[PDB]
Design an enzyme around this catalytic site. Structure first.
Site, short mmCIF file in Angstrom:
data_model
loop_
_atom_site.label_atom_id
_atom_site.label_comp_id
_atom_site.label_asym_id
_atom_site.label_seq_id
_atom_site.Cartn_x
_atom_site.Cartn_y
_atom_site.Cartn_z
N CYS A 91 10.67 27.44 64.73
CA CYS A 91 11.37 26.99 63.51
C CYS A 91 10.80 25.65 62.98
O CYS A 91 9.99 24.99 63.65
CB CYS A 91 12.87 26.84 63.78
N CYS B 172 12.99 25.08 69.17
CA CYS B 172 12.17 25.87 68.25
C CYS B 172 11.31 25.00 67.34
O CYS B 172 10.25 25.44 66.84
CB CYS B 172 13.03 26.82 67.43
#
Ligand SMILES: Nc1ncnc2c1ncn2[C@@H]1O[C@H](COP(=O)(O)OP(=O)([O-])OC[C@H]2O[C@@H]([n+]3cccc(C(=O)O)c3)[C@H](O)[C@@H]2O)[C@@H](O)[C@H]1OP(=O)(O)O
Length: 249
Positions: free
Chosen positions: A158, A76
């Site tokens: 992320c 991520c």
């Protein structure tokens, strides 16, 4: 009849079925972790999303079975988004192999640069013409596919998510783009810490452009940090990415 075309947009890419299947086989060769995938089942689920359906009536749910079969965990913190600068974004991750655009995932890889649609109430693929997003209708097989995978890809991101934008273009950031309308708004402030844009050049400081501040304002309202960098020579940028040993970097 035969002189008229149903739609304003290009038709389905010639040999689309063979191409999707061959792309699936090749992807699962290059990327062993996805070899569990049955390429025939993927094609069946892809085909099932749009065939016999009116090409202005496609839903995200139509693609759910394909989404399931193409489930894939990318790191991520290694995601590169982009808008209007597909080529350099893709060349970047061809060299920087631990980073991923959507088209480096199985699903994005299958569909990249392809067009497809079916016909209402037949099982034929339409090879003459397919809806154009702007002139015909937005809920077409291609646009609905990209919206669905672009959302999910954004939601999975992320840490520091990077976005490549085209500084030589009319609007460097465009709120109506897929990046602007689907991805920006599905960045999770809990997972995502920062969005850093790389504004590429084609020939000043572009991180002060109005639309970049629009983007800055938008990401701030989502409680994510914004950062921006100019890339003054994309040619050199790629060379330095390929050989970070080189001193002139
Ligand atoms: N509002 C919209 N409705 C329907 N289609 C649209 C819309 N906005 C853009 N597109 C189409 O998506 C493509 C990307 O170029 P952008 O310059 O539009 O770049 P972008 O749209 O920001 O880029 C796409 C982002 O999502 C992904 N994406 C989206 C679409 C296609 C592909 C591909 O690889 O093939 C990939 C990619 O990972 C990237 O992060 C163009 O073909 C656009 O069609 P148009 O403006 O020429 O009519």
């Amino acid at each position: 009849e035969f002189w008229r075309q149903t739609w304003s947009g290009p038709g389905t890419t010639k040999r689309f079925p063979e191409t999707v299947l061959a792309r699936c086989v090749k992807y699962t060769e290059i990327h062993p972790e996805m070899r569990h995938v049955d390429c025939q089942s993927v094609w069946d689920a892809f085909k099932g999303a749009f065939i016999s359906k009116h090409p202005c009536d496609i839903t995200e749910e139509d693609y759910q079975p394909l989404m399931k079969l193409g489930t894939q965990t990318v790191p991520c913190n290694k995601i590169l988004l982009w808008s209007r600068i597909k080529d350099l974004a893709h060349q970047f991750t061809q060299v920087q192999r631990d980073m991923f655009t959507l088209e480096d995932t199985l699903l994005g890889y299958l569909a990249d640069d392809l067009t497809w649609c079916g016909e209402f109430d037949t099982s034929k693929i339409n090879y003459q013409s397919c809806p154009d997003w702007r002139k015909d209708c937005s809920n077409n097989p291609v646009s609905v596919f990209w919206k669905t995978v672009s959302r999910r890809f954004a939601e999975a991101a992320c840490d520091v998510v990077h976005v490549m934008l085209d500084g030589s273009r009319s609007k460097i950031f465009d709120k109506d783009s897929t990046f602007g309308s689907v991805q920006v708004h599905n960045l999770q402030p809990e997972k995502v810490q920062t969005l850093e844009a790389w504004v590429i050049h084609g020939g000043r400081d572009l991180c002060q452009d109005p639309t970049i501040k629009e983007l800055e304002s938008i990401i701030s309202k989502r409680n994510i940090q914004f950062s921006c960098k100019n890339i003054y020579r994309p040619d050199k940028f790629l060379q330095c990415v390929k050989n970070p040993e080189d001193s002139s970097c």
